[PDB]
Design a protein around this ligand. Structure first.
Ligand SMILES: Cc1cc2nc3c(=O)[nH]c(=O)nc-3n(C[C@H](O)[C@H](O)[C@H](O)COP(=O)(O)O)c2cc1C
Length: 147
């Protein structure tokens, strides 16, 4: 199966979780493509992919509710071609804030609205992949069960 992991990371934690997931999922025997959202072009982004994993860290203040580069992507979700594609979301954040990883539900909500099938429960964790290998690895496993 072909998996795209697109992520937005401003201090590298979500980017870190994305690296790990690719690792874990490629060890499942799959072809994975890692994509920085700062380098992504929404238009037809999902073409050729069996599933798409979206990573977006949380930023409560100035930043309209999401990470920079992901916000520009998200806003063009309906150009991505998610209809009938497997999708899941993950994020790094901090519990000490009122809204912990609020972009996870949003991504699931939108993708679902566009004909996409959520295959795994949203990953909400703190720190990098090494901070919570177990949470990371449950997300990957869930994913691998639908591929
Ligand atoms: C100014 C600021 C506001 C933040 N607001 C939130 C927020 O409201 N919700 C949340 O879950 N995390 C929030 N965070 C915590 C970051 O999301 C956390 O450090 C995360 O792991 C960084 O993700 P990234 O390195 O992948 O970009 C905030 C961080 C900063 C410094």
């Amino acid at each position: 199966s072909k998996v795209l992991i697109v992520f937005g990371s401003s201090t590298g934690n979500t980017e870190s979780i994305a690296q790990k997931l690719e690792e874990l999922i490629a060890a499942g025997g799959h072809e994975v493509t890692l994509l920085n959202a700062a380098d992504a072009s929404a238009e037809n982004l999902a073409d050729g992919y069996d599933a798409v994993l979206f990573g977006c860290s949380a930023w409560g203040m100035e930043d309209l509710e999401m990470q920079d580069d992901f916000l520009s992507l998200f806003e063009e979700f309906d150009r991505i071609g998610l209809a009938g594609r497997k999708v899941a979301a993950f994020a790094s954040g901090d519990q000490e804030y009122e809204h912990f990883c609020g972009a996870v539900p949003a991504i699931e909500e939108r993708a679902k609205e566009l004909g996409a099938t959520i295959i795994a429960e949203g990953l909400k964790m703190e720190g990098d992949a090494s901070n919570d290998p177990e949470a990371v690895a449950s997300f990957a496993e869930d994913v691998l069960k639908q591929l």
